[PDB]
Amino acid sequence: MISLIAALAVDRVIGMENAMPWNLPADLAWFKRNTLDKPVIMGRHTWESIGRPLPGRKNIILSSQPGTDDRVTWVKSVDEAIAACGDVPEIMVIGGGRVYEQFLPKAQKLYLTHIDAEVEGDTHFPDYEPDDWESVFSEFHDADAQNSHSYCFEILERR
Amino acid sequence: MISLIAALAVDRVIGMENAMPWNLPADLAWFKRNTLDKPVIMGRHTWESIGRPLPGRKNIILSSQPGTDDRVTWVKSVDEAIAACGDVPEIMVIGGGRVYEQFLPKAQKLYLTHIDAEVEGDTHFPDYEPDDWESVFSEFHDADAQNSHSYCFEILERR
């Protein structure tokens, strides 16, 4: 199955011009723990903000143009994206906006991180009807010496 | 010799209750690069903010109270701190504010990261007389897909 993994500030903002202005090592740790050993699908802008292959994971990048790095996999469509995954139990879609909108429909599960931050951005998570998703986990955490803002982990399953 | 390394937002703000609201991997690599194979000196607050010993370097934490982690060196005075460094060509002071303030009068060099981040914080970098320091390097960078805010690296030598 397909799962999307994302980190949302208030109002589902998930992106802007430059890197999101927050320091959340706790989020990244969760990102890793839930993506390790799986295939990762991301769009070109997300690949740029990451700038190097994610280890231990199979990296597939969506782009209408030829790729720029021999290290990872490049695909030109959603269907090639999947097919490149092979037979696998779970597929993780990691950003950005455009990719999420195309994939939200195929997804069975969501991995959200609701961050208590208000930032002005140009990219939003797509809307989703809770009355379609069943929350199967959730856990909040206050900000601290390591994480710049409060955040809460949450997992939902398509009903 | 003693050197202080620090990242400053506008008005010398260096800290607050929780981790700073920025995301600057480029700053981190500069930090790793200028600290490599050197003893690092930090205050308790900064140790808790890092969360683990920095690898391949000697960690020395200042605290008026008994240490609580066997993997790092705890000391009770600036002197003990220096003595634990031993005979080395460069000692690095990584924060926070109370620490910097003690060691600035002894520093021969400052490795500054000037960030175009305007944040609300309680802690400041001490004040330094410019006619006291020589600027021996600077390198600016615009914010990007990886770095949340613009930044400029600097290196000054005490005259």
Ligand SMILES: CN(Cc1cnc2nc(N)nc(N)c2n1)c1ccc(C(=O)N[C@@H](CCC(=O)O)C(=O)O)cc1
């Ligand atoms: C910016 N980008 C995309 C990114 C970041 N946080 C997110 N957070 C969540 N929850 N979901 C996402 N899809 C998301 N995507 C990144 C950038 C760096 C790393 C990264 O360093 N990850 C390392 C973790 C390394 C480290 O822990 O410093 C890893 O091995 O997963 C991941 C994603």
Ligand SMILES: CN(Cc1cnc2nc(N)nc(N)c2n1)c1ccc(C(=O)N[C@@H](CCC(=O)O)C(=O)O)cc1
């Ligand atoms: C929060 N804190 C203190 C910190 C952060 N940035 C600074 N930036 C500058 N310029 N100077 C400092 N003293 C400074 N201190 C940290 C937090 C994490 C790491 C850290 O992981 N550094 C790794 C770098 C790992 C990486 O490259 O991702 C190291 O190897 O030293 C360091 C300092």
